[PDB]
Write a protein that binds this ligand. Structure first.
Ligand SMILES: O=C(O)/C(O)=C/C(=O)C1(Cc2ccc(Cl)cc2)CCN(Cc2ccccc2)CC1
Ligand SMILES: [Mn+2]
Ligand SMILES: [Mn+2]
Length: 184
């Protein structure tokens, strides 16, 4: 799980919180903490360097350092990570959700915006959304091409801290109508 230190910060914030706006910022900070936690552990399993929200321009500069970043016609996306093997660019994104609705929105965005640049660099760009179901703890990965490189991937983590902290937050603001009907 997260460091004792990070769990303490959430515990302190949840207990000090008197107001729905503060409460929702914790709710959102937990989802993001959980996403980043899966990110770090996933990157250990894949044995690739851990990254977050990498500017696409930097990814291009890394795999093709001759490219002038002032002129290249590149999309403005910040994918969580990426892998370049056998002249194939895998654009990786971490997801922690029980559904694919977010996965699809990200895949649709990243797929559409990377068709042009793939054609220009003559490098096939494979969009890999690596999602863990936080309940079942099962890995769902869309890209068949990516799953050939990494045929069996055990992460073996859990989100019981995240579930507890969230539950404590919904317990505390359970009769705050404004908290229960506020969005990210
Ligand atoms: O949902 C994800 O899996 C994910 O990684 C998203 C993000 O990283 C952004 C921040 C974020 C939001 C929510 C979560 Cl759970 C984790 C991170 C939101 C979309 N991003 C929008 C954006 C795109 C391009 C340029 C600026 C901002 C900002 C970062
Ligand atoms: Mn991201
Ligand atoms: Mn992500």
């Amino acid at each position: 799980g997260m460091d004792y230190q990070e769990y303490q910060q959430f515990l302190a914030r949840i207990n000090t919180a008197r107001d729905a706006c503060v409460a929702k910022d914790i709710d959102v900070d937990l989802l993001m903490a959980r996403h980043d936690y899966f990110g770090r552990e996933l990157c250990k399993s894949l044995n690739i360097e851990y990254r977050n929200d990498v500017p696409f321009i930097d990814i291009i500069l890394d795999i093709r350092p001759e490219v002038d970043p002032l002129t290249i016609d590149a999309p403005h996306i910040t994918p969580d990570n990426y892998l370049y093997i056998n002249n194939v660019l895998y654009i990786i994104d971490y997801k922690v959700s029980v559904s694919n609705e977010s996965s699809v929105i990200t895949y649709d965005k990243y797929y559409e915006l990377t068709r042009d640049i793939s054609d220009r660099l003559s490098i096939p760009i494979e969009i890999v959304i690596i999602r863990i179901d936080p309940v079942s703890r099962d890995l769902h990965i869309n890209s068949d091409r990516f799953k050939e490189l990494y045929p069996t991937i055990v992460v073996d983590i859990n989100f019981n801290q995240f579930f507890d902290l969230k539950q404590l937050l919904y317990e505390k603001f359970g009769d705050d109508e404004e908290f229960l009907l506020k969005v990210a």
